[PDB]
Design a protein around this ligand. Sequence first.
Ligand SMILES: Cc1ncc(COP(=O)(O)O)c(CN[C@@H](Cc2ccc(O)cc2)C(=O)O)c1O
Ligand SMILES: Cc1ncc(COP(=O)(O)O)c(CN[C@@H](Cc2ccc(O)cc2)C(=O)O)c1O
Lengths: 382, 382
Amino acid sequence: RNMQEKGVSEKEILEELKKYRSLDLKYEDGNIFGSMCSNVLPITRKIVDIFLETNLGDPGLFKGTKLLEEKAVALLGSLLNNKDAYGHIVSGGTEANLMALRCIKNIWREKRRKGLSKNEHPKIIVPITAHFSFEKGREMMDLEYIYAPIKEDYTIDEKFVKDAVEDYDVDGIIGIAGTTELGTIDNIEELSKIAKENNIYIHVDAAFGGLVIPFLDDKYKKKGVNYKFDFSLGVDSITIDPHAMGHCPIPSGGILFKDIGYKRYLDVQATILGTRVGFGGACTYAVLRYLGREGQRKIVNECMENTLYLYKKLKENNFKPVIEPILNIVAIEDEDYKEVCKKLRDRGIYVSVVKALRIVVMPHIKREHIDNFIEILNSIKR
Amino acid sequence: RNMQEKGVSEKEILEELKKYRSLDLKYEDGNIFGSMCSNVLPITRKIVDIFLETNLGDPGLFKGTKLLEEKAVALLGSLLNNKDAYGHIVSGGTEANLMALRCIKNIWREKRRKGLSKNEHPKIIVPITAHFSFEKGREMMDLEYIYAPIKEDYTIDEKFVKDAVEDYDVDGIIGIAGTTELGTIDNIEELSKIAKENNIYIHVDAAFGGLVIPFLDDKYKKKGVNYKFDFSLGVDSITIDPHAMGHCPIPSGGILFKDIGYKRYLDVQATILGTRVGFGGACTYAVLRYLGREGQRKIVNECMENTLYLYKKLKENNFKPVIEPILNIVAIEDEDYKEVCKKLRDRGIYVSVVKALRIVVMPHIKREHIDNFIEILNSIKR
Ligand SMILES: Cc1ncc(COP(=O)(O)O)c(CN[C@@H](Cc2ccc(O)cc2)C(=O)O)c1O
Ligand SMILES: Cc1ncc(COP(=O)(O)O)c(CN[C@@H](Cc2ccc(O)cc2)C(=O)O)c1O
């Protein structure tokens, strides 16, 4: 397509764009099974329109939108047991994780300048289940990762972390509250004890789980799983994303630090982006206020009901889930997962791909879609 | 503000948000004089709504939105004289510049792995007029910058660059097509010759100027200024941002590489962000199609008419512009610029702050606002 001298009418360009949108899948149609995003809360469409022409890169021009970012951060902080959190509503969990990594690296830099570190690059303990944003950060910022192995329950091996912190000079620890692949929860309580006893920064990636775990009804909690992950454990920062299980429009990611003392280690404006949306903070604040805990609890446990329904139907049909679900994520063991995924795609079922098919039971996934999924999968298996 | 158990009604939360929005400035009100963002083209509000629930981080689910990103990149490429450009509609000029820096660094890494570079970190020539995103990149990616001085016309000293490339092993050159502070245009033609003759990557930052320079009427072009900046000069990449002078909603930044061969140097998904908006590509494609060159020409040269009106009125009132404007940016020499800026702010005029006040004559700035500005400034000066 080449740039043209003459413009076209609104009707022409809107009809063209609608033809392309018709090629997309839509969350509400029973096709998308592998996404950690879903339909936005309908009220957010009005909020996006109100705040479209704001820019939190120049907050002096948009004092009210800036106050709403602060209020959104405060509500997330309150949810995470910290009324003094310092943070931002950023572009997503990637930027949030990258900012935590920047903070870790600048704490190390200060030590390095004072002769208080023998590491030529920050050394950070990262579980092998970490999201790919951590690899982007390693690659960009020249970080040294010590990859921590996982246990049979797919959570980080805390004894490895403890041993590594004794053997090596460590600049940071990462724990995950809701892994991307399986929805498992690292033992943040133990990791935070190790971190505190050794004066090591600890970041919790709760991009997905941060807006699920605090709302789980007791019947979905498992004996021997610890669900504690937030600032009550004294962690240094938490990633938590409204555009995942907060029903907010992209871009709405969250990064919270324990207090304002961390801001100075984000100096080079604290965000990676410059010009940036104002509607994310507005939507985050408004959705949490509109729903309250009661409304988010309802949505979370509706997803969990459908998750456990899917788990049951899978076993009934002789499929092997990787684990009993912890959050609203189920994975199905399959040796031919790559080909099965393509056969599912050919029949209108888009899962993600551990030698397993991964299903994220977001609010758009209803019982009828799970039944449909099981029928197609059964047929594929002959 | 604390998280509450009970939710609130839509009317309550919308009225609260509207009270905060009322504390913001609005572009159309004659207050904002220092922003490189402005009012969006009204059609984009419909496009945002259509594409709100898309995600270019998972383009396999949104094939049409992904095609629209490709078409948006193709139209920008065509505008920049390259029908084969490889690129993305990203979150802004910051992410675009960071991706160019990542590419430069990974070309260096490959050399380093083969023993073909004596530099322990990429060495990049950057003019002192570079936008702050280049400092974010330096700080994150451990780049070594050789800062190039500027000439009396505030453009990069090409002889310094040539000499430095002879004296040192250089991994990249940055040229700016529309500086943030003054709107000047580096001699990209000469920089590209140096770069080509020495096999050095060259990136052009046209975040602002890329959607102005191609549309300038001849009466605004100055003798002795070279306006050539695009892929006709053989440069490696160009940043160009629709949410600046493309009238598209944030986030709509642009990064274009000369061809698909650069994609492999963005390997670690090529964007920094993961989950990311689909409406930026839709809006970028649709605005350029809706306006055509004729419609963008009209807007650009309307801004330039108002820029030269402001320049004239300033001189008539014995104020000293830093330079005769090149793009739709004027700066006013003032020793007490900091205090004058605060006095302007107190009277409803928000400029930015070179010991000068900076005015960006975006489409929302009309003659009446310039007249109002001059009266207030005169009064402030007594
Ligand atoms: C634990 C965790 N941390 C960080 C991130 C990064 O967040 P952003 O994508 O907001 O930057 C993700 C993303 N999780 C999903 C994101 C996603 C969403 C929708 C999709 O259709 C596909 C993928 C994933 O990579 O699987 C995540 O799972
Ligand atoms: C040449 C140049 N390159 C890159 C960027 C970064 O682009 P993003 O801000 O899209 O990441 C800018 C931003 N120029 C403006 C951005 C801006 C816009 C509106 C404002 O109110 C204030 C600032 C500046 O920093 O001045 C720029 O001027």
